């Protein structure tokens, strides 16, 4: 911060070697995930008995949802939706059911209510997405359709991620029921859906997608195309969602047939295995350092 | 026709498995997980009883001529809950989470399944692979955590009769996303036909513990320290 | 010995979370939108400072 | 309407058997732990709205 400099040596900035290109190395899978099959099933189970499906070992495309329907509610919590198309996951859990239109607000972590406490409960650390779209046209009857039921009573609360199917008479009085008349009710009540019903009471189809990370090597990701492999150059690399920048070289490490990564004392990644061709690659950071300027006086 | 005799014995230093899939070389690592404590008290069965599952199970056997074949897991194990079923035969291994109507005294006819269960039921998951059971000591660790059934195995040559005094690390064998609750388990035996036979195995239970593991130049675990056994081990783990 | 110990502690301090979802900035940036990433980045900044 | 409650034993199961409340929100205290706390006095304000 001066226009004149005295004689000496000064440390000014830092230098770093820039990357040249980008490398993407995904495993070769062409199988498509049954997202379409899970949808448009022409029959969804009730809220008190919600359908659960496991999705793994396929290529996940989320444009099918985009062309599916104009969803009334589409909320993602742990991940931004727009970035869903380039992530890798271990496995996916899809839970499908049908509820009332106005009950969609109750489907969220840290939420209370009739449905949120008696039919479905989400964990506090939920990582996934929730989709809710209207189904008045397909799940309504002129006389009234009662195929869908919801639970109204329970002895205690519900933990996240469990399903209750036991059917019994709920007790409200002190004396044991052994009957129906005196202060004893039925927790399950049938939904009443009619076309003349307005918005907020027509049936709405709800699908909850649950992901997880920090697990076995990822399986559900194939929406992006792979590239070639280069060595001895500063490059950006992406192996099954593990991203970084550096130089990849041949490695002489005796990996046992079940490891994938490799760490050191400081606990940072230094070796990797190529998914498509089983081979050990050493990773080294690109060159960086300080810059000093040597000058006599400006006089 | 079946006689089961119980005894108690020492576990020494056995039942150590690889915690994760990360390669490490020439390093000492502190880990916290469900382990079998050193010099613990294991049960010796000699030849079925139904045993608890708790949090995890360590199983060891040394029988010959393939007397022992598979295990069954569950919580009620009769008609109301899907139950695991691992079956090992000459060519392959079956794994079924199907709902079985188990017999009062399940066993293998050797080869109809009517001796185990009357019929299957509404079930989805199934798996098949190369047989697990490949003078020889076979060690297994089973544990069920957060929607995952994990099995580690190890095969060793033995010349003695009791637990060998040595160290062996159990490499991972299989991981399955089953997602059920397990509380009891039982062993499955095969009887030629009703001829009387004999077998022997050892059972232990896992507990949460902190260990110090040693990785050599090649990424193999060669020694470990149990940090809560005695003051010297605590000092070793501190340093 | 003291110099090596201090340097090792400083390097090892980089794998802590300081009450965030992850200790890696790359995945935080690759799985979150800008309005929600800074709420996690600032905690790492404070801890490392 | 405002009422003051003091010098008594407070049981919250009567509310549970009362009715299936549409809204039940507690701010400074978790509802489940209301059954083992001690308070100086309670103020109950009752009315009817839309
Ligand atoms: C689902 O099924 C309906 C009717 O069977 C069909 O019109 C539609 O194309 C299918 N696929 C999707 C993505 O909706
Ligand atoms: C759940 O979805 C699967 C997928 O086709 C279907 O076979 C099954 O009948 C569904 N169950 C219920 C209760 O809707
Ligand atoms: C997939 O990649 C592996 C790794 O190089 C290769 O051995 C295999 O032949 C490939 N298969 C297909 C169908 O591309
Ligand atoms: C194991 O338990 C038995 C009784 O269950 C007891 O007598 C014995 O001392 C314990 N320890 C060993 C090493 O057997
Ligand atoms: C062994 O099991 C495999 C797979 O279940 C089966 O194909 C084969 O027939 C079995 N062999 C015998 C002798 O039972
Ligand atoms: C299996 O479970 C389904 C779903 O509850 C049920 O409809 C069926 O009757 C059960 N039994 C069989 C043999 O499928
Ligand atoms: C590691 O492997 C090499 C090559 O087989 C071997 O010479 C060396 O003894 C091994 N390390 C140990 C501790 O045995």
Tell whether ligand 3 has an atom less than 6 A from the beta carbon of residue A279.
no
As given in the structure block, the two tokens for residue C1 are 């010995």
Separation in Å, CA A222 to CA A88, A240, B120, C8: 8, 10, 36, 39
Question: By three-state DSSP, how is residue B219 classified?
Answer: coil
Compute φ and ψ for B112, nearest 5 degrees: -70, 145
Name which of A14, A89, A25 is nearest A292 in CA terms. A14
| CA–CA distance, A189 with A166 (Å, rounded to integer) | 14
Contact call for residues B39 and B163 (beta carbons, < 8 A): no
Q: Do A87 and C30 lie within an 8 Å CB cutoff?
A: yes
- Is the four-CA dihedral B86, B87, B88, B90 of positive or negative sign? negative
Taking CB atoms and an 8 Å cutoff, what residues of chain C touch A124? none
| CA–CA distance, B219 with B27 (Å, rounded to integer) | 9
| CA–CA distance, C26 with A269 (Å, rounded to integer) | 14
Helix (H) / strand (E) containing B16: strand B16-17
| CA–CA distance, B176 with B145 (Å, rounded to integer) | 11
Tell whether ligand 4 has an atom less than 6 A from the beta carbon of residue B8.
yes
Interface check A163 vs B, CB under 8 A: no
Put residue D22 in one of left, alpha, beta given phi > 0 → left and psi -120 to 50 → alpha.
Answer: alpha
Q: What angle do CA A158, B97, A222 make, to 5 degrees?
A: 85
Nearest by CB: A259 against B22, B27, B175 = B22
Contact call for residues A20 and A234 (beta carbons, < 8 A): yes
As given in the structure block, the two tokens for residue B79 are 């008609």
Name which of A297, A299, A295 is nearest A10 in CA terms. A295
| CA–CA distance, B79 with C43 (Å, rounded to integer) | 52
Considering only residues 1 to 50 of chain D, which have any Cβ-Cβ distance to chain A shorter than 8 Å? 17, 20, 24-25
Question: By three-state DSSP, how is residue A236 classified?
Answer: strand
CA–chain centroid gap for B61, Å, is 9
Compute the distance from residue B141 Cα to the ligand 7 centre, in Å: 27
Tokens 């089953």, located at residue: B178
Contact call for residues B133 and B61 (beta carbons, < 8 A): no
Q: How far is B172 from chain A (nearest CA, A)?
A: 8
Q: Do A112 and D17 lie within an 8 Å CB cutoff?
A: no
CA–chain centroid gap for A52, Å, is 15
Pairing of strands B169-176, B16-17: parallel
Tell whether ligand 2 has an atom less than 6 A from the beta carbon of residue A45.
yes
Name which of B191, B6, B7 is nearest B105 in CA terms. B191
Contact call for residues A48 and A119 (beta carbons, < 8 A): yes
* Structural biology method used: cryo-EM
| CA–CA distance, B26 with B123 (Å, rounded to integer) | 46
Tokens 């978790």, located at residue: D30
Contact call for residues A144 and A42 (beta carbons, < 8 A): no
Mutate to test the pocket of ligand 6, among B122, B123, B124 (most ligand atoms within 8 A of CB): B122
Separation in Å, CA B53 to CA A129, B40, B72, B117: 35, 17, 11, 21
DSSP state of A139: S
Q: Supply the Cα-derived Rg of chain C in whole angstroms.
A: 13
Contact call for residues A88 and A243 (beta carbons, < 8 A): no
Taking CB atoms and an 8 Å cutoff, what residues of chain B touch A216? 21, 175
Contact call for residues B91 and B131 (beta carbons, < 8 A): yes
Name which of B25, B18, B30 is nearest B212 in CA terms. B30
Contact call for residues A201 and A102 (beta carbons, < 8 A): yes
Taking CB atoms and an 8 Å cutoff, what residues of chain D touch A172? 17
Question: Which residues, including other chains, have CB under 8 Å from residue A39's CB and lie 6 or more apart?
Answer: A64, A68, A207
Tell whether ligand 4 has an atom less than 6 A from the beta carbon of residue B121.
no
Pairing of strands B136-145, B68-74: unpaired
| CA–CA distance, A115 with A122 (Å, rounded to integer) | 11
Name which of B157, B180, B182 is nearest B64 in CA terms. B157
A–B: how many Cβ contacts below 8 A? Answer: 41
Bridge partners (DSSP) of residue A96 are: A51, A207
> Which atom of ligand 3 lies at the shortest distance from residue A275's CA?
4
| CA–CA distance, D13 with D8 (Å, rounded to integer) | 15
Q: Which residue of B has its CA nearest to A55?
A: B177
Compute φ and ψ for B34, nearest 5 degrees: -85, 110
Resolution value (Å, 1 decimal): 2.6
Chains contacting chain D through 3 or more C-beta pairs under 8 A: A
Tell whether ligand 2 has an atom less than 6 A from the beta carbon of residue A106.
no
Contact call for residues B83 and B100 (beta carbons, < 8 A): yes
Tokens 């185990």, located at residue: B116
Is chain D touching chain C, with at least 3 CB–CB pairs below 8 Å? no
| CA–CA distance, A271 with A281 (Å, rounded to integer) | 6
- Is the four-CA dihedral B95, B139, B144, B181 of positive or negative sign? positive
The number of beta carbons lying within 10 Å of the beta carbon of residue C33 is 13
| CA–CA distance, A277 with C49 (Å, rounded to integer) | 42
Compute the distance from residue C47 Cα to the ligand 6 centre, in Å: 54
As given in the structure block, the two tokens for residue A102 are 């106005």
| CA–CA distance, A222 with A212 (Å, rounded to integer) | 17
Strands, E assignment, chain A: 8-16, 22-25, 51-55, 73-76, 92-100, 128-134, 149-151, 170-171, 184-185, 188-190, 203-210, 235-239, 242-250, 271-273, 280-284, 288-295
Question: Which residues, including other chains, have CB under 8 Å from residue B163's CB and lie 6 or more apart?
Answer: B9, B10, B11, B12, B14, B60, B202
CA–chain centroid gap for B153, Å, is 7
DSSP state of B114: G
DSSP state of A193: B
| CA–CA distance, B163 with B156 (Å, rounded to integer) | 11
Pairing of strands A8-16, A51-55: unpaired
DSSP state of A195: T
| CA–CA distance, C44 with C25 (Å, rounded to integer) | 9
Compute the distance from residue B84 Cα to the ligand 6 centre, in Å: 18
Structure-derived torsion over alpha carbons of residues A159, A164, A168, A170, reported in degrees to the nearest 10 = 30
Bridge partners (DSSP) of residue A244 are: A237
As given in the structure block, the two tokens for residue A160 are 């996240």
The number of beta carbons lying within 10 Å of the beta carbon of residue A181 is 6
| CA–CA distance, A283 with B127 (Å, rounded to integer) | 37
Q: Do D20 and A112 lie within an 8 Å CB cutoff?
A: no
Q: Do C30 and A266 lie within an 8 Å CB cutoff?
A: no
Question: By three-state DSSP, how is residue A92 classified?
Answer: strand
């Amino acid at each position: 911060k001066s226009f004149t400099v005295e004689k000496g040596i000064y440390q000014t900035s830092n230098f770093r070697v820039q990357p040249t290109e980008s490398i993407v190395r995904f495993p070769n899978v062409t199988n498509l995930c049954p997202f379409h099959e899970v949808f448009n099933a022409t029959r969804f189970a009730s809220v008190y008995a919600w359908n659960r499906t496991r999705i793994s070992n396929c290529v996940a495309d989320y444009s099918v949802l985009y062309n599916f329907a104009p969803f009334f509610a589409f909320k993602c919590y742990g991940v931004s939706p727009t970035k869903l198309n380039d992530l890798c996951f271990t496995n996916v859990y899809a839970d499908s059911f049908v509820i009332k239109g106005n009950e969609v607000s109750q489907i969220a972590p840290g939420q209370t209510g009739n449905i949120a406490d008696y039919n479905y409960k989400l964990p506090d650390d939920f990582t996934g997405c929730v989709i809710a779209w209207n189904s008045n046209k397909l799940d309504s009857k002129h006389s009234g359709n009662y195929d869908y039921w919801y639970r109204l009573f329970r002895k205690s609360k519900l933990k996240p991620f469990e399903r209750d199917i036991s059917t019994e008479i709920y007790q409200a009085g002190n004396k044991p029921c052994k009957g129906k008349g005196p202060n004893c009710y039925f927790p399950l009540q049938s939904y009443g859906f009619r076309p003349t019903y307005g918005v907020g009471h027509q049936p709405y189809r709800v699908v909850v997608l649950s992901f997880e990370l920090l697990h076995a090597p990822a399986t559900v990701c194939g929406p992006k195309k792979s590239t070639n492999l280069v060595k001895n150059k500063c490059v950006n690399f992406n192996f099954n969602g593990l991203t970084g920048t550096g130089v990849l070289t041949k490695s002489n490490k005796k990996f046992l047939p079940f490891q994938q990564f490799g760490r050191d004392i400081v606990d940072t990644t230094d070796a990797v295995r190529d998914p498509q061709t089983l081979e050990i690659l050493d990773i080294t950071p690109c060159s960086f350092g300080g810059v000093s300027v040597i000058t006599p006086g400006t006089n | 026709l079946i006689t089961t005799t119980q005894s108690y014995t020492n576990s020494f230093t056995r039942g150590v498995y690889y915690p994760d899939k990360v390669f490490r070389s020439s390093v000492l690592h502190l880990t916290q997980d469900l382990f079998l404590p050193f010099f613990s008290n294991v049960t010796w069965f000699h030849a079925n009883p139904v045993l608890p599952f708790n949090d995890g199970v360590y199983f060891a056997s040394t029988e010959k001529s393939n007397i022992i074949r598979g295990w069954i897991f569950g919580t009620t194990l009769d008609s109301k809950t899907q139950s695991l079923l691992i079956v090992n035969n000459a060519t392959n291994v079956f794994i079924k989470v199907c709902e079985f109507q188990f017999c009062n005294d399940p066993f293998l006819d050797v080869e109809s399944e009517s001796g185990v269960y009357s019929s299957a039921n509404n079930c989805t998951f199934e798996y098949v692979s190369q047989p697990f059971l490949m003078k020889n000591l076979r060690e297994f660790v089973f544990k069920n955590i957060d929607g995952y059934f994990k099995i580690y195995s190890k095969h060793t040559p033995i010349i003695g009769r009791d637990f060998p005094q040595g160290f062996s690390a159990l490499e991972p064998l299989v991981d399955l996303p089953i997602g059920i609750n397990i509380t009891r388990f039982q062993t499955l035996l095969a009887l030629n036909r009703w001829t009387a036979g004999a077998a022997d195995y050892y059972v232990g239970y896992l507990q949460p513990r902190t260990f110090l593991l040693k990785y050599n130049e090649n990424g193999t675990i060669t020694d470990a320290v149990d940090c809560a056994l005695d003051p010297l081990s605590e000092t070793k783990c501190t340093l | 010995n003291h110099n090596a110990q201090a340097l090792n502690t400083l390097v090892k301090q980089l794998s802590s979370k300081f009450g965030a979802i992850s200790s890696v900035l790359n995945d935080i940036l690759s799985r979150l939108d800008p309005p929600e990433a800074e709420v996690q980045i600032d905690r790492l900044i404070t801890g490392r400072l």
